[PDB]
């Protein structure tokens with residue numbers, strides 16, 4: 054029941070995802086690893102402890118390096134894995150940039166809207182891709198050679214569910230979405246007309262509605278099970294929740310950067326509030342090829 | 344009791360051990376660690392694998408912050424992966440031996456020997472004195488060498504507490520730990536091993552034998568005077584039999600080490616001299632370390 058235009062839209066998004074999502078993370082290299090006023094600290098300390106994870110490094114030889122984080126006592130212990138997660142987030146975003154560049158509807162947009170759209174959807178597209186490698190039964194993001202396993206807590210599943218980011222990943226994983234529905238979610242999140250700095254509001258909004266219409270159609274043709282009733286509205290609701298979480302963790306990120314500077318050059322540009330001159334790295338990447 | 348000379352003999356060995364055995368391994372730094380991520384050569388390569396599967400351990404590096412890095416060894420895949428922890432264990436050995444060289448130099452009986460005999464004694468006893476020191480930090484309840492922040496936990500070979508006992512090196516450590524020796528008895532074992540008159544290259548065989556006999560008499564007298572007489576009636580002979588077994592183990596692992604060096608060169612310069620890879624001109628590093 055999909056139109057030819059809609060079939061073409063899903064083919065280009067699926068092709069772009071394949072060409073720009075390093076699911077095995079085999080090209081993620083040269084990352085930092087953990088080495089072998091007062092009220093602001095208390096808020097920040099709660100932020101980081103909510104997402105405590107152990108890092109696992111699998112080698113082609115079969116070896117495994119495992120990092121267990123220190124317990125939450127004293128200060129500057131919570132910042133152990135932050136530099137590594139900053140290097141990982143930066144790598145994920147460079148793939149997000151390449152994802153948008155392949156899309157024809159995005160490439161033809163003005164360079165300032167391209168910068169503004171990626172600046173506003175970076176975290177959201179990054180979390181959507183993390184969800185496709187998230188293992189809900191083990192609480193682990195399986196990123197090829199690297200694995201990020203959630204540390205146990207005293208409250209357990211119920212206490213972790215109080216963290217919105219963690220709750221987003223479990224709820225979205227339970228929808229059992231297809232690759233096409235994720236990539237259409239990524240497109241809908243990317244082409245948001247109400248992002249700060251967008252000038253072609255009407256052009257981006259038209260693009261967004263068509264991506265959403267194509268998602269609604271795809272679900273109607275391939276998801277006749279009763280478990281998938283209202284799946285389109287559920288997905289659209291999850292996308293609205295992710296936008297809310299992005300704001301929370303944009304301010305968390307800025308608090309944590311102030312107390313302790315952990316950001317890469319590209320992440321600092323994304324959080325800097327001439328667009329091209331302020332984002333020189335992002336402008337260069339958008340101009341480069343694949 | 345013991346003669347005052349035997350008492351001074353123990354006082355000097357304990358003083359030597361105190362100044363040269365870094366029990367916490369705090370000064371063991373800048374070591375290498377495993378990385379983040381033909382027809383008869385096939386024979387020699389086949390022997391090396393068997394040698395490296397006998398003693399499989401996982402490395403734990405505990406941090407000041409409370410973090411725990413842990414390395415699990417790869418299973419054999421017929422490649423360089425089998426030589427993953429050898430660069431680290433070559434830095435560990437070199438670090439331990441330099442403490443052994445320092446141990447012998449503080450002992451007065453060892454300094455008065457000819458330098459060529461000092462080199463010969465250190466060559467034959469370095470593996471034995473290193474394993475004797477390792478046993479004092481070996482926990483048999485968990486199969487782990489507790490080297491300060493570093494831990495080396497033996498891996499379960501599916502026949503744990505039975506398959507590991509086949510390897511004479513592991514059997515040596517479990518058996519020696521069961522004797523529950525004192526610090527003075529450990530240091531006397533080291534002296535008996537160091538002053539072995541039958542090591543290759545020794546020329547003052549009569550002098551070194553006399554010395555070994557007097558350390559052994561001190562050890563026997565120490566056990567008679569400082570332990571319940573009937574229960575430890577044969578503790579001295581048990582210790583001498585463990586030292587005899589360690590000499591046999593030494594010969595076996597000296598060959599293992601030389602075969603592995605032939606295929607994959609991992610040794611440090613000081614270790615290369617120790618394994619033969621004029622005595623003073625063939626061991627110039629060890630010679631300088633003794634002069635200083």
Ligand SMILES: CCC[C@H](CC)Oc1ccc(C(C)(C)C)cc1NC(=O)c1nnn(-c2cc(C)c(OC)cc2OC)c1C
Nearest residue numbers: 101104106134135138142146175176179194201302306323
């Ligand atoms: C395995 C991924 C899933 C889990 C998530 C719970 O990972 C972690 C696990 C643990 C930790 C701790 C640091 C240990 C608390 C953090 C993280 N996670 C991040 O550190 C992150 N996740 N996304 N981002 C991010 C990415 C981009 C492009 C961006 O551009 C505006 C802004 C961003 O943050 C505002 C970022 C920076």
Ligand SMILES: CCC[C@H](CC)Oc1ccc(C(C)(C)C)cc1NC(=O)c1nnn(-c2cc(C)c(OC)cc2OC)c1C
Nearest residue numbers: 398400428429432436440469470473488495596597600617
């Ligand atoms: C805390 C110690 C760890 C455990 C404890 C037994 O051991 C291993 C456990 C595992 C491994 C593997 C590498 C994983 C196979 C090796 C080793 N062990 C060595 O790599 C060693 N242990 N001692 N030596 C050594 C030292 C000296 C001065 C020497 O001078 C002639 C000759 C030597 O070997 C011929 C050496 C070279």
